[PDB]
CSV table of C-alpha atoms (C1' of nucleotides) in Angstrom, one decimal:
chain,number,residue,atom,x,y,z
A,1,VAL,CA,-2.2,40.8,102.2
A,2,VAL,CA,-2.6,38.6,99.3
A,3,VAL,CA,0.0,38.9,96.2
A,4,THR,CA,-0.9,37.7,92.8
A,5,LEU,CA,1.9,38.0,89.7
A,6,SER,CA,1.3,38.1,86.6
A,7,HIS,CA,2.9,36.2,83.6
A,8,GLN,CA,4.7,39.3,82.3
A,9,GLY,CA,4.7,40.6,85.8
A,10,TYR,CA,2.3,42.7,87.6
A,11,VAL,CA,2.9,43.0,91.0
A,12,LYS,CA,0.0,44.0,93.5
A,13,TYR,CA,-1.0,43.3,97.1
A,14,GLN,CA,-4.6,44.1,98.9
A,15,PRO,CA,-5.8,43.7,102.2
A,16,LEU,CA,-7.4,40.6,103.0
A,17,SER,CA,-10.6,41.4,104.4
A,18,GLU,CA,-11.7,42.8,101.8
A,19,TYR,CA,-13.1,38.8,100.8
A,20,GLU,CA,-15.6,36.5,102.7
A,21,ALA,CA,-15.6,32.9,103.1
A,22,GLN,CA,-18.5,31.3,100.7
A,23,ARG,CA,-19.9,28.0,100.5
A,24,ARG,CA,-18.1,25.1,98.7
A,25,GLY,CA,-19.6,25.3,95.6
A,26,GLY,CA,-19.7,28.9,94.4
A,27,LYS,CA,-18.4,30.5,91.4
A,28,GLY,CA,-16.5,33.4,93.2
A,29,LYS,CA,-15.9,36.9,92.0
A,30,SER,CA,-13.3,38.5,90.0
A,31,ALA,CA,-9.9,39.6,91.7
A,32,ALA,CA,-7.7,41.8,89.6
A,33,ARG,CA,-8.1,42.7,85.5
A,34,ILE,CA,-6.0,40.9,82.4
A,35,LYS,CA,-4.8,41.8,79.7
A,36,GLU,CA,-5.7,41.3,75.9
A,37,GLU,CA,-3.5,38.2,76.3
A,38,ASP,CA,-2.5,37.9,80.1
A,39,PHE,CA,-2.8,35.3,82.7
A,40,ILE,CA,-1.7,34.7,86.6
A,41,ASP,CA,1.2,32.8,87.5
A,42,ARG,CA,0.9,32.1,91.2
A,43,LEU,CA,-0.5,33.6,94.4
A,44,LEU,CA,0.9,34.2,98.0
A,45,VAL,CA,-0.3,35.2,101.4
A,46,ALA,CA,1.9,36.7,103.8
A,47,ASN,CA,2.4,39.4,106.7
A,48,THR,CA,3.3,43.3,105.7
A,49,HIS,CA,6.5,43.3,107.4
A,50,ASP,CA,8.1,39.9,106.3
A,51,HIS,CA,11.4,39.4,104.0
A,52,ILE,CA,11.0,37.9,100.7
A,53,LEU,CA,13.2,35.9,98.4
A,54,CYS,CA,12.7,36.1,94.5
A,55,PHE,CA,14.4,33.3,92.8
A,56,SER,CA,14.6,34.3,88.9
A,57,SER,CA,14.5,32.1,86.0
A,58,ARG,CA,18.7,31.5,85.4
A,59,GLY,CA,19.0,31.0,89.3
A,60,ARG,CA,19.9,34.4,90.6
A,61,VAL,CA,18.3,35.1,94.4
A,62,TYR,CA,17.0,38.6,95.6
A,63,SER,CA,16.0,40.3,98.6
A,64,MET,CA,13.0,42.6,99.7
A,65,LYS,CA,10.2,43.3,102.1
A,66,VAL,CA,6.4,43.1,100.9
A,67,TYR,CA,5.5,46.7,102.0
A,68,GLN,CA,7.5,47.9,99.4
A,69,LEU,CA,5.4,46.1,97.0
A,70,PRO,CA,3.1,48.2,95.0
A,71,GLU,CA,-0.9,48.9,96.4
A,72,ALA,CA,-3.3,49.4,94.0
A,73,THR,CA,-7.2,47.8,94.4
A,74,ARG,CA,-9.2,45.0,92.4
A,75,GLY,CA,-9.7,47.5,89.3
A,76,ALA,CA,-5.8,48.2,89.0
A,77,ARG,CA,-3.6,45.5,86.9
A,78,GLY,CA,-0.2,46.9,88.8
A,79,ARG,CA,3.1,48.1,88.0
A,80,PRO,CA,5.7,46.0,86.3
A,81,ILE,CA,8.4,44.2,88.3
A,82,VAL,CA,11.8,45.4,86.4
A,83,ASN,CA,11.5,48.8,88.3
A,84,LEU,CA,11.9,46.9,91.4
A,85,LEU,CA,14.2,44.6,90.8
A,86,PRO,CA,17.3,44.7,88.1
A,87,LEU,CA,16.1,41.3,85.9
A,88,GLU,CA,17.2,40.8,82.3
A,89,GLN,CA,15.2,41.0,79.2
A,90,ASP,CA,13.1,37.8,79.5
A,91,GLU,CA,14.2,36.6,83.4
A,92,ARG,CA,11.2,36.0,85.6
A,93,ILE,CA,10.1,35.3,88.8
A,94,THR,CA,9.4,31.8,90.0
A,95,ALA,CA,9.3,31.0,93.5
A,96,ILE,CA,8.9,34.0,96.4
A,97,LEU,CA,9.7,32.1,100.0
A,98,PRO,CA,8.5,34.6,103.1
A,99,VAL,CA,11.1,34.4,105.8
A,100,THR,CA,10.3,36.6,109.0
A,101,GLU,CA,13.8,36.2,110.3
A,102,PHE,CA,17.4,34.4,110.0
A,103,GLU,CA,18.5,32.7,113.0
A,104,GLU,CA,20.1,29.3,114.3
A,105,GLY,CA,21.9,26.9,111.3
A,106,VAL,CA,18.3,25.9,109.4
A,107,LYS,CA,18.6,24.6,106.1
A,108,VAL,CA,16.8,25.4,102.6
A,109,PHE,CA,14.8,22.7,100.9
A,110,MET,CA,14.6,23.7,97.1
A,111,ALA,CA,13.5,21.4,94.5
A,112,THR,CA,13.2,21.9,90.7
A,113,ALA,CA,11.3,20.3,87.9
A,114,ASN,CA,12.1,16.7,86.2
A,115,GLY,CA,12.7,15.7,89.8
A,116,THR,CA,16.1,17.2,91.4
A,117,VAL,CA,16.8,18.4,94.8
A,118,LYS,CA,19.2,20.6,96.7
A,119,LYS,CA,19.9,21.7,100.5
A,120,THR,CA,21.9,24.5,101.3
A,121,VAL,CA,22.0,26.6,104.8
A,122,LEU,CA,20.5,29.8,105.3
A,123,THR,CA,23.2,31.8,106.9
A,124,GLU,CA,24.1,32.2,103.2
A,125,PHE,CA,21.8,34.2,102.9
A,126,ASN,CA,21.8,36.6,105.2
A,127,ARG,CA,22.9,39.8,103.6
A,128,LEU,CA,22.6,40.5,99.5
A,129,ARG,CA,23.4,43.0,97.4
A,130,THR,CA,21.3,45.0,94.8
A,131,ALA,CA,22.7,41.9,92.1
A,132,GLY,CA,21.8,39.2,93.1
A,133,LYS,CA,23.3,35.5,94.0
A,134,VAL,CA,23.4,32.1,92.1
A,135,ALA,CA,21.7,29.5,93.9
A,136,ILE,CA,21.3,26.8,91.4
A,137,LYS,CA,22.9,25.5,88.1
A,138,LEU,CA,20.1,24.7,86.2
A,139,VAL,CA,20.2,23.0,83.0
A,140,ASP,CA,18.4,23.0,79.9
A,141,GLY,CA,14.5,24.0,80.8
A,142,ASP,CA,14.6,22.8,83.9
A,143,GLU,CA,12.7,25.3,86.2
A,144,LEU,CA,12.4,25.6,90.2
A,145,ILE,CA,9.2,24.9,91.7
A,146,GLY,CA,8.9,25.0,95.5
A,147,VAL,CA,11.3,26.1,98.3
A,148,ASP,CA,10.5,25.9,102.1
A,149,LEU,CA,12.8,26.0,105.9
A,150,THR,CA,13.7,22.6,107.6
A,151,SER,CA,15.7,21.8,110.5
A,152,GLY,CA,18.0,19.0,110.7
A,153,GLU,CA,15.6,15.7,110.5
A,154,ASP,CA,12.3,16.0,108.9
A,155,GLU,CA,10.2,14.9,106.4
A,156,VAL,CA,10.0,15.6,102.5
A,157,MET,CA,6.8,15.1,99.9
A,158,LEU,CA,6.7,15.5,96.3
A,159,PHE,CA,3.5,15.8,94.1
A,160,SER,CA,3.5,14.9,90.6
A,161,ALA,CA,1.6,15.5,87.7
A,162,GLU,CA,0.2,12.0,87.2
A,163,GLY,CA,-1.1,11.2,91.2
A,164,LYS,CA,2.2,10.0,92.5
A,165,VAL,CA,3.2,10.9,95.7
A,166,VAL,CA,7.3,10.4,97.5
A,167,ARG,CA,8.8,10.4,100.8
A,168,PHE,CA,11.9,9.7,102.3
A,169,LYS,CA,13.5,11.2,104.7
A,170,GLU,CA,15.9,13.8,104.0
A,171,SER,CA,18.7,12.5,105.9
A,172,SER,CA,19.9,11.4,102.5
A,173,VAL,CA,20.3,14.7,100.8
A,174,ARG,CA,23.4,16.1,101.5
A,175,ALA,CA,24.5,19.8,101.9
A,176,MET,CA,26.0,21.4,99.4
A,177,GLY,CA,27.4,24.7,97.7
A,178,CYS,CA,25.9,27.8,96.3
A,179,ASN,CA,26.6,26.7,92.8
A,180,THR,CA,26.4,22.8,92.3
A,181,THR,CA,23.3,21.0,90.3
A,182,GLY,CA,21.9,18.7,93.1
A,183,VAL,CA,20.8,14.9,93.3
A,184,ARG,CA,17.6,13.3,91.5
A,185,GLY,CA,14.7,13.2,93.9
A,186,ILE,CA,12.1,11.0,92.1
A,187,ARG,CA,12.0,8.9,89.0
A,188,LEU,CA,9.5,10.3,87.0
A,189,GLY,CA,7.9,9.2,83.8
A,190,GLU,CA,7.1,10.6,80.7
A,191,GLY,CA,5.6,13.8,80.8
A,192,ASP,CA,5.2,14.1,84.1
A,193,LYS,CA,6.6,17.5,86.3
A,194,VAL,CA,6.7,17.9,89.6
A,195,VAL,CA,4.2,20.7,91.3
A,196,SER,CA,4.3,21.3,94.7
A,197,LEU,CA,6.6,20.2,98.2
A,198,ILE,CA,5.0,19.6,101.6
A,199,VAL,CA,6.7,18.9,104.7
A,200,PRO,CA,5.0,17.4,107.1
A,201,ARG,CA,4.9,18.9,111.0
A,202,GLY,CA,3.3,17.0,113.5
A,203,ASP,CA,-0.4,15.9,113.1
A,204,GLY,CA,-2.9,17.0,110.3
A,205,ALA,CA,-4.3,16.4,107.3
A,206,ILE,CA,-3.4,16.5,103.8
A,207,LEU,CA,-5.9,18.6,100.7
A,208,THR,CA,-5.5,18.4,97.1
A,209,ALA,CA,-6.8,19.6,94.2
A,210,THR,CA,-6.9,19.6,90.5
A,211,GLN,CA,-7.1,22.1,87.6
A,212,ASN,CA,-11.2,21.3,87.4
A,213,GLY,CA,-11.9,22.5,90.9
A,214,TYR,CA,-11.5,19.0,92.9
A,215,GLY,CA,-10.0,17.4,95.5
A,216,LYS,CA,-10.4,16.0,99.0
A,217,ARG,CA,-8.6,15.3,102.6
A,218,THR,CA,-6.7,12.3,104.1
A,219,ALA,CA,-4.9,11.4,106.7
A,220,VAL,CA,-1.1,12.3,107.2
A,221,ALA,CA,-0.3,8.8,108.8
A,222,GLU,CA,-1.8,6.6,105.6
A,223,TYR,CA,1.1,8.2,103.5
A,224,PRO,CA,4.7,5.7,103.6
A,225,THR,CA,8.0,5.9,103.8
A,226,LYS,CA,10.6,4.6,101.5
A,227,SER,CA,13.9,5.4,100.1
A,228,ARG,CA,13.8,8.4,97.7
A,229,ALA,CA,15.0,8.0,94.1
A,230,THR,CA,11.5,6.0,93.4
A,231,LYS,CA,8.2,5.8,92.2
A,232,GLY,CA,5.8,6.7,94.2
A,233,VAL,CA,1.9,5.7,94.7
A,234,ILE,CA,-1.7,6.8,93.7
A,235,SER,CA,-2.3,9.6,95.2
A,236,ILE,CA,-5.8,10.7,93.9
A,237,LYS,CA,-7.2,9.3,91.0
A,238,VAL,CA,-6.6,11.6,88.1
A,239,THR,CA,-9.7,10.1,85.9
A,240,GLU,CA,-11.3,12.5,83.6
A,241,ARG,CA,-13.6,14.9,85.0
A,242,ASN,CA,-10.8,15.9,87.6
A,243,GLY,CA,-7.6,16.5,85.1
A,244,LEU,CA,-4.5,17.1,86.1
A,245,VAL,CA,-3.1,17.8,89.5
A,246,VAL,CA,-2.3,21.7,90.3
A,247,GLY,CA,-1.1,21.4,94.3
A,248,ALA,CA,-1.5,20.4,97.6
A,249,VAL,CA,-0.9,21.6,101.1
A,250,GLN,CA,-1.2,20.3,104.6
A,251,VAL,CA,-4.5,22.1,106.4
A,252,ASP,CA,-5.3,21.0,110.0
A,253,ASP,CA,-8.3,21.9,111.6
A,254,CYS,CA,-10.2,25.7,111.5
A,255,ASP,CA,-8.3,27.0,108.7
A,256,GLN,CA,-9.6,28.4,105.5
A,257,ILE,CA,-7.8,27.9,101.6
A,258,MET,CA,-8.0,30.2,98.6
A,259,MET,CA,-8.0,29.2,95.2
A,260,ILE,CA,-7.5,31.1,92.3
A,261,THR,CA,-7.8,30.5,88.3
A,262,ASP,CA,-6.8,32.0,85.4
A,263,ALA,CA,-8.4,34.9,84.9
A,264,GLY,CA,-9.2,36.2,88.6
A,265,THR,CA,-12.2,34.8,90.1
A,266,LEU,CA,-11.3,34.2,93.5
A,267,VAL,CA,-12.9,32.0,96.4
A,268,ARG,CA,-12.0,31.0,99.7
A,269,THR,CA,-14.1,28.8,102.1
A,270,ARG,CA,-13.5,26.8,104.7
A,271,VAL,CA,-11.8,22.9,105.1
A,272,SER,CA,-15.1,21.6,107.5
A,273,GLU,CA,-16.9,20.8,104.2
A,274,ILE,CA,-14.3,18.4,102.9
A,275,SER,CA,-15.0,15.0,104.2
A,276,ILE,CA,-12.5,12.2,104.9
A,277,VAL,CA,-11.8,9.2,102.3
A,278,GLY,CA,-8.8,7.1,101.6
A,279,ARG,CA,-5.8,7.4,99.3
A,280,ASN,CA,-6.8,6.3,95.9
A,281,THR,CA,-10.6,7.6,96.0
A,282,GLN,CA,-11.6,10.9,93.7
A,283,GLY,CA,-13.0,14.1,95.7
A,284,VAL,CA,-15.9,16.6,95.8
A,285,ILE,CA,-16.9,19.7,93.2
A,286,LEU,CA,-14.4,22.8,95.4
A,287,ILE,CA,-15.1,25.6,92.3
A,288,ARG,CA,-18.4,25.6,89.9
A,289,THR,CA,-15.5,26.9,87.5
A,290,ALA,CA,-16.6,27.7,84.0
A,291,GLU,CA,-15.7,26.3,80.4
A,292,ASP,CA,-12.0,27.5,79.5
A,293,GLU,CA,-10.5,27.8,82.9
A,294,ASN,CA,-8.4,25.9,85.2
A,295,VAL,CA,-7.5,26.7,88.9
A,296,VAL,CA,-3.3,27.5,89.1
A,297,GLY,CA,-3.0,28.8,92.9
A,298,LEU,CA,-3.8,27.0,96.1
A,299,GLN,CA,-2.6,28.8,99.7
A,300,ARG,CA,-3.9,28.5,103.4
A,301,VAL,CA,-5.6,31.4,105.7
A,302,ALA,CA,-4.7,30.6,109.1
A,303,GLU,CA,-6.8,32.1,111.9
B,1,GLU,CA,1.1,81.1,100.0
B,2,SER,CA,2.4,83.5,102.8
B,3,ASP,CA,0.5,86.7,103.1
B,4,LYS,CA,-0.3,89.2,106.0
B,5,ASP,CA,-2.2,87.0,108.4
B,6,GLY,CA,1.2,84.6,108.4
B,7,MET,CA,3.3,81.9,106.9
B,8,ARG,CA,2.5,79.1,105.0
B,9,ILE,CA,4.4,76.6,102.8
B,10,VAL,CA,2.0,74.0,101.0
B,11,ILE,CA,3.5,70.4,99.8
B,12,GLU,CA,1.2,68.1,98.2
B,13,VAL,CA,2.1,64.4,97.8
B,14,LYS,CA,1.1,62.4,95.2
B,15,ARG,CA,-2.0,59.7,95.8
B,16,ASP,CA,0.1,56.5,96.5
B,17,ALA,CA,2.5,57.5,99.0
B,18,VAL,CA,2.7,58.6,103.1
B,19,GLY,CA,3.0,62.0,104.3
B,20,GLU,CA,4.9,61.1,107.5
B,21,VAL,CA,8.1,59.6,105.6
B,22,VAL,CA,8.3,62.1,103.2
B,23,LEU,CA,8.3,64.5,106.2
B,24,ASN,CA,10.8,62.7,107.8
B,25,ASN,CA,12.8,63.0,104.8
B,26,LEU,CA,12.6,66.2,104.9
B,27,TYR,CA,13.6,67.1,108.3
B,28,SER,CA,16.8,64.5,107.8
B,29,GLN,CA,17.9,65.9,104.1
B,30,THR,CA,16.7,69.9,104.3
B,31,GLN,CA,17.3,73.0,106.4
B,32,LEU,CA,14.1,72.2,108.0
B,33,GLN,CA,16.3,71.2,111.6
B,34,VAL,CA,19.5,72.6,111.9
B,35,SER,CA,22.3,73.0,114.3
B,36,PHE,CA,23.4,75.8,116.9
B,37,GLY,CA,26.8,76.2,117.8
B,38,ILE,CA,26.8,77.7,121.5
B,39,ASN,CA,30.3,79.4,121.8
B,40,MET,CA,29.9,81.9,125.4
B,41,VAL,CA,33.2,84.4,125.0
B,42,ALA,CA,33.1,87.4,126.1
B,43,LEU,CA,35.9,90.6,127.6
B,44,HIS,CA,36.2,90.6,131.1
B,45,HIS,CA,38.9,93.6,132.0
B,46,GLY,CA,39.6,93.8,129.1
B,47,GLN,CA,40.5,90.0,128.3
B,48,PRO,CA,39.0,87.3,126.5
B,49,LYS,CA,37.3,84.4,128.9
C,1,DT,C1',-26.8,34.1,95.0
C,2,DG,C1',-27.9,31.8,100.2
C,3,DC,C1',-31.2,28.2,104.0
C,4,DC,C1',-35.0,24.6,104.8
C,5,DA,C1',-37.0,18.6,102.9
C,6,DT,C1',-36.2,15.5,99.3
C,7,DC,C1',-34.2,12.2,97.7
C,8,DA,C1',-32.7,8.3,93.9
C,9,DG,C1',-27.5,6.6,91.9
C,10,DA,C1',-23.9,5.6,93.7
C,11,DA,C1',-18.6,7.0,95.0
C,12,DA,C1',-16.1,3.9,98.9
C,13,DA,C1',-14.4,0.3,102.2
C,14,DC,C1',-13.2,-5.0,103.3
C,15,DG,C1',-11.1,-10.2,103.1
C,16,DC,C1',-8.6,-12.0,99.1
C,17,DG,C1',-5.2,-12.8,95.2
C,18,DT,C1',-0.4,-12.0,93.0
C,19,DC,C1',3.5,-10.1,90.2
C,20,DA,C1',6.1,-5.0,89.6
C,21,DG,C1',8.8,-2.1,91.7
C,22,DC,C1',11.9,-2.4,95.9
C,23,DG,C1',16.6,-2.7,98.6
C,24,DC,C1',20.8,-5.0,98.4
C,25,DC,C1',25.6,-7.0,96.3
C,26,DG,C1',28.9,-5.9,92.8
C,27,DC,C1',31.5,-2.0,89.7
C,28,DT,C1',32.5,2.5,87.0
C,29,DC,C1',32.9,7.4,86.3
C,30,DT,C1',32.0,12.3,86.2
C,31,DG,C1',31.6,16.6,89.6
C,32,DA,C1',31.5,19.4,94.3
C,33,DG,C1',35.5,21.0,96.5
C,34,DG,C1',39.7,22.6,97.5
C,35,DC,C1',43.2,25.8,95.7
C,36,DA,C1',44.7,30.2,93.0
C,37,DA,C1',43.9,34.8,90.2
C,38,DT,C1',40.8,38.9,88.8
C,39,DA,C1',37.6,42.0,89.1
C,40,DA,C1',34.0,45.2,90.8
C,41,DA,C1',31.0,47.4,94.6
C,42,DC,C1',31.2,48.9,99.9
C,43,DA,C1',32.2,51.6,103.0
C,44,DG,C1',35.0,54.7,105.6
C,45,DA,C1',38.2,58.7,105.1
C,46,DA,C1',40.3,63.2,103.2
C,47,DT,C1',39.2,67.1,101.1
C,48,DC,C1',36.7,71.1,99.7
C,49,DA,C1',33.2,74.7,98.7
C,50,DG,C1',29.7,77.7,101.1
C,51,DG,C1',27.3,80.5,104.9
C,52,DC,C1',27.7,83.6,108.8
D,1,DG,C1',36.6,80.7,113.0
D,2,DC,C1',33.0,77.1,112.7
D,3,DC,C1',29.8,73.7,111.1
D,4,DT,C1',27.8,70.9,107.6
D,5,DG,C1',27.0,68.9,102.5
D,6,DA,C1',28.9,67.0,98.5
D,7,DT,C1',32.7,64.9,95.6
D,8,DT,C1',37.4,62.2,95.1
D,9,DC,C1',40.8,58.8,97.2
D,10,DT,C1',41.5,53.9,99.6
D,11,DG,C1',41.7,49.4,101.7
D,12,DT,C1',38.6,45.5,102.2
D,13,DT,C1',35.2,42.7,101.2
D,14,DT,C1',33.0,39.4,97.9
D,15,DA,C1',31.6,36.6,93.6
D,16,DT,C1',33.3,34.7,89.4
D,17,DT,C1',36.8,32.7,86.3
D,18,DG,C1',40.1,28.0,85.4
D,19,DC,C1',42.6,22.7,87.0
D,20,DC,C1',42.9,18.6,88.9
D,21,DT,C1',41.7,15.2,91.7
D,22,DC,C1',38.9,11.5,94.2
D,23,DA,C1',35.2,10.0,96.5
D,24,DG,C1',30.3,9.6,96.5
D,25,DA,C1',26.6,8.8,92.9
D,26,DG,C1',24.8,6.3,90.0
D,27,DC,C1',24.0,1.0,86.6
D,28,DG,C1',22.9,-4.0,85.8
D,29,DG,C1',20.9,-8.8,87.9
D,30,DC,C1',18.0,-11.3,91.6
D,31,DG,C1',13.6,-12.5,96.1
D,32,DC,C1',10.7,-10.6,97.4
D,33,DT,C1',7.6,-8.2,98.9
D,34,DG,C1',4.1,-5.0,99.9
D,35,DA,C1',0.2,-2.2,96.5
D,36,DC,C1',-3.2,-2.2,93.8
D,37,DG,C1',-8.2,-5.3,90.8
D,38,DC,C1',-12.8,-8.3,93.0
D,39,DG,C1',-19.2,-6.9,95.1
D,40,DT,C1',-21.4,-5.9,98.6
D,41,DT,C1',-22.8,-2.5,102.1
D,42,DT,C1',-24.3,3.3,103.2
D,43,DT,C1',-23.5,7.0,103.5
D,44,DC,C1',-23.6,10.3,101.2
D,45,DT,C1',-23.6,13.6,97.0
D,46,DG,C1',-26.1,15.9,93.7
D,47,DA,C1',-30.7,17.9,91.8
D,48,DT,C1',-35.5,20.3,93.1
D,49,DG,C1',-38.5,23.3,95.0
D,50,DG,C1',-40.1,26.8,99.2
D,51,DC,C1',-38.2,31.2,97.0
D,52,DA,C1',-34.6,34.4,100.3
DNA sequence: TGCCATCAGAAAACGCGTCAGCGCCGCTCTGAGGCAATAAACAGAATCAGGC
DNA sequence: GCCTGATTCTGTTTATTGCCTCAGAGCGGCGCTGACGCGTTTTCTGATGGCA
């Protein structure tokens, strides 16, 4: 199923088989209805029988199963999420991590904006009560962006909003407790934010997207590895038509992806149509988005 | 809606629910399922046994 | 809104050239972490009506 | 007298709050390197039309 979340908070999931894959330059059809002043925030694709961990805006963590979410159709707008979870007056959800099961001693890698990283063991989150648990000592306006599961030794990649990518070994980061801030991962400039987090696992291709519906596909091996807390390299030329970077994901062959704008307009397409180019190159169109619209979602669909 | 034909009790579920879960909950919580304790005691030659 | 020519215009590799950020030394210091005390929840007993 | 559902204790487990450290994280100066500008190929991506 595919899960959508609004700014005020209105969860909704619908079967994935309803939508169909169009060609590259497609307008797309609407997904849900939006109030007089609202916009969707994030998109998720997961199975029904999977645990999900929700991270709030104040560092709390909550546990839930997918099928407990309300079921609705395209015309509906969903129901407020405050009923499902005992949230605060202004606390909001900003990250969801699907977990099939808890096993071994794997670690949870969490990275916020402004270039901060933190590593914790998954064993701490085996059981959670109705009330949440503090996970990050967030300061000022910093917010979580992405989380993932990693083994003892792996690689981590961070993407900024101005085409800067940093790749470094995860052995530098040391496991810390729950009530800790973390260390600095990437040296940002001025007015730049981290937008995505990708852990490369085996051979594949890296797909990127912008806010105006442009993207490309480059090989993994061309990206270099250096120390942490350093500036990156040019992941993609921002130019003027493309706009800012919105996200990235590692997609191999024979897969499909979905993108969503501020107001519905979901589109699904294959990945074989996207060509292979170098790192410092602007890509081709992916969505023929109308004016006053921005792509704010990107997910991968397997087969 | 019981009548001369026989017993008939009607329960309507909401449009956004599943009947099987409700039926299982009713089995678990109400008297739709009960327990019977068997204890055979009778008089034999004027004595309990 | 989707399948076939048919384009021209132009995005993009590639062998050179350089200087702007990396590693690597020193040093200084602020925040995890150990330790202890409080206060809630959680779950298991223990008791009490109710119906034959 | 027997079995069950509902309410009331009681010991255990867990999250949160202070205090004080040191040891790991961060800052400043220096050599030297990889990563980013240059035109010609080139194929390849949009635009146009048969409408379907």
